[PDB]
Symmetry: T
Subunit: 64 residues, 12 copies
Amino acid sequence: VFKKVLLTGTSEESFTAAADDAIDRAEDTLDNVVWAEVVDQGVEIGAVEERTYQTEVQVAFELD
Amino acid sequence: VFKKVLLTGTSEESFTAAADDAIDRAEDTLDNVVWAEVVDQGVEIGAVEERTYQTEVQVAFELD
Amino acid sequence: VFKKVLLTGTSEESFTAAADDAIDRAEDTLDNVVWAEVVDQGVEIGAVEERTYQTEVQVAFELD
Amino acid sequence: VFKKVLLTGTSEESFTAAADDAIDRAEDTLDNVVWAEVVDQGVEIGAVEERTYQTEVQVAFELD
Amino acid sequence: VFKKVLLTGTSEESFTAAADDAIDRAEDTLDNVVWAEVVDQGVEIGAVEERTYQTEVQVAFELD
Amino acid sequence: VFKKVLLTGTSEESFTAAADDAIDRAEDTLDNVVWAEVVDQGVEIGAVEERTYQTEVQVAFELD
Amino acid sequence: VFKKVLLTGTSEESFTAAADDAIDRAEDTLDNVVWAEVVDQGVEIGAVEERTYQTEVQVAFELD
Amino acid sequence: VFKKVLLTGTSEESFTAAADDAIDRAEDTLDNVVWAEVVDQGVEIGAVEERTYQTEVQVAFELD
Amino acid sequence: VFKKVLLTGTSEESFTAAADDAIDRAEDTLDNVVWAEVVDQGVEIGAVEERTYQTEVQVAFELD
Amino acid sequence: VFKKVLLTGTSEESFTAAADDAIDRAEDTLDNVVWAEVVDQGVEIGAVEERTYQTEVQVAFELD
Amino acid sequence: VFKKVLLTGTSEESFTAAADDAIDRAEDTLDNVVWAEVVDQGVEIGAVEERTYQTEVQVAFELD
Amino acid sequence: VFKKVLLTGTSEESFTAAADDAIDRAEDTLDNVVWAEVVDQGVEIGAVEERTYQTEVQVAFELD
Ligand SMILES: [Cl-]
Ligand SMILES: [Cl-]
Ligand SMILES: [Cl-]
Ligand SMILES: [Cl-]
Ligand SMILES: [Mg+2]
Ligand SMILES: [Mg+2]
Ligand SMILES: [Mg+2]
Ligand SMILES: [Mg+2]
Ligand SMILES: [Mg+2]
Ligand SMILES: [Mg+2]
Ligand SMILES: [Mg+2]
Ligand SMILES: [Mg+2]
Ligand SMILES: [Mg+2]
Ligand SMILES: [Mg+2]
Ligand SMILES: [Mg+2]
Ligand SMILES: [Mg+2]
Ligand SMILES: [Mg+2]
Ligand SMILES: [Mg+2]
Ligand SMILES: [Mg+2]
Ligand SMILES: [Mg+2]
Ligand SMILES: [Mg+2]
Ligand SMILES: [Mg+2]
Ligand SMILES: [Mg+2]
Ligand SMILES: [Mg+2]
Ligand SMILES: [Mg+2]
Ligand SMILES: [Mg+2]
Ligand SMILES: [Mg+2]
Ligand SMILES: [Mg+2]
Ligand code: NA
Ligand code: NA
Ligand code: NA
Ligand code: NA
């Protein structure tokens, strides 16, 4: 059985790096992370000093 | 990194109050709740004495 | 077996009340109304004296 | 010919009032506003003192 | 308040049995599982000895 | 001209059998049923003694 | 309150004429038809002597 | 950089002609119109003497 | 077993004729074309002398 | 690089078996079939002696 | 009240840089740009000497 | 007439490079590749030594 968690990663460099930021966090806390699916991408402009790319991912991990 | 949880709040008064019901529950248990996105709305009619409005929300919170 | 009818209710007060307007009509004519799912919301501005909120719902009822 | 503008209204009271906030702004600046379609709803929690409901609408107006 | 978890169950027999596999796992770990909504179906062919049907479900459970 | 009715069939056995349950009901009451399109699938867990699979279908029938 | 019926009209001439075919049928049987929304378009090629255009519409009519 | 405007054209003849009606209006007021994407089609029946076809288009134009 | 190919037909006359243009091409090269489903419509304005309507279709054909 | 082909399988028994029917055909003609994603399900009722379940799948295969 | 404009940025380097190209243009002409949401990505191959990545964004800005 | 093929490219570097990987393969085998539309993005984590970005594209090419 796989479970997914819905995470938004952020990066000041790129959408790819924002995806990685989310996946890195998942791997810090979860065992057996297997894949991720991109579900949204965006850019924060007003609340930040530097534009921040965001990529939201469903991160799948195998239970047991 | 933000994480979202998918919650359905309920209210006998309104769709807004049902959203609040979900958000209230998130804030009881989670730190750093930042926003919520409505993903569905419905009304329970048959299994209840009074019509119950429901609003399903992705509730986002900041990790760390 | 459940069947759904696709109804648009209207209200000069709110989206919740417009949903109720549709559900009320369903209950006038149908037995065993069980739930409703919101599928669209809108506001009529030009053809009306007062802004009219509309909520379109699939209203489910149990056959037999 | 109708044209639509994509506006997000806000309210500390309700999703209906947030829709109105967007429509009010459209009517301040545009002639012949005819209808609005809700396309998204959300709640701002972290960046505000009071929860703020938001309703995003396509607001249609008649050209000429 | 209901919460949903997004689970992918698997089966070498059928899509129905894959849904059950996910629901069984939810019921092992959660109290008050109430319903599930199918959100995706697929078949694993290359990484397996026997074709494996998968059904991804949002599994809803009542909080408290 | 074809017309569709939106029916949810149920079964304690499978999603296929739940589709059939809806189609059977349509054929009891309508002439000239021609096809059905699956639009949703779900499982009722809490309100039932045995898990009940549901399949919602648009059932098309030829008018005249 | 408006209600919609989901009709597929057909024509050997065009998608517009297929929409009209559905609307004509609605107006034969229903009072107060107000609008229609196109939801799908297709072409039947194999089961027919001449290609047949089809347009599926939600046809809205005012109740009472 | 391209920008899109969301226009609904109308015609008493066809969906194609309604698309053209929107595009014509865009070309009256904008330089460098390059393409249009159909996003919705509908028919106005009740508020008009003759059925009026409508086609909503995103009309893209090149900035600078 | 049916297979679909995703084709974009073009016409300087109409969306219907653009669909036909795609279907004609499919029938030139494939046996047993049975139906087509419209998936997108657009208009090319800038790269052409005359506006060109386009209709993208999944064209289904029976294998064997 | 993976490529997908869009196939509709059929079965007089079940949606699972209809998926298999499509996948079987892909494996007859293609090397390195790896997975399939269900994209639609339906039932043919009028043109057949026995109800025929159909499952449409994107079947992915590895190029080279 | 926020308003969104729908812009397609382009880049010969990456999808991230194409998003930036759109956002840069918005910031040249608009005050109070706050965020952007990616709605589509594509690559122009035939009409260009070098492949050109495109990213279409809704760019939100605060009115007043 | 344009035809599209649905390809998933892969890269250990970025989503842009994964799109290119798919487009490169299309250009190896097809004449007159004109554009590509991104339809999905994902990351393979478990079955690989290094995270592999994937971008799925519809690649359009002109027939004849
Ligand atoms: Cl828009
Ligand atoms: Cl989710
Ligand atoms: Cl419907
Ligand atoms: Cl496809
Ligand atoms: Mg930096
Ligand atoms: Mg988002
Ligand atoms: Mg009360
Ligand atoms: Mg729901
Ligand atoms: Mg009042
Ligand atoms: Mg509507
Ligand atoms: Mg207050
Ligand atoms: Mg939003
Ligand atoms: Mg077995
Ligand atoms: Mg999936
Ligand atoms: Mg049993
Ligand atoms: Mg449902
Ligand atoms: Mg003729
Ligand atoms: Mg259809
Ligand atoms: Mg005329
Ligand atoms: Mg519309
Ligand atoms: Mg001509
Ligand atoms: Mg297109
Ligand atoms: Mg049999
Ligand atoms: Mg289908
Ligand atoms: Mg360069
Ligand atoms: Mg696009
Ligand atoms: Mg490397
Ligand atoms: Mg995918
Ligand atoms: Na989730
Ligand atoms: Na219906
Ligand atoms: Na817009
Ligand atoms: Na395809």
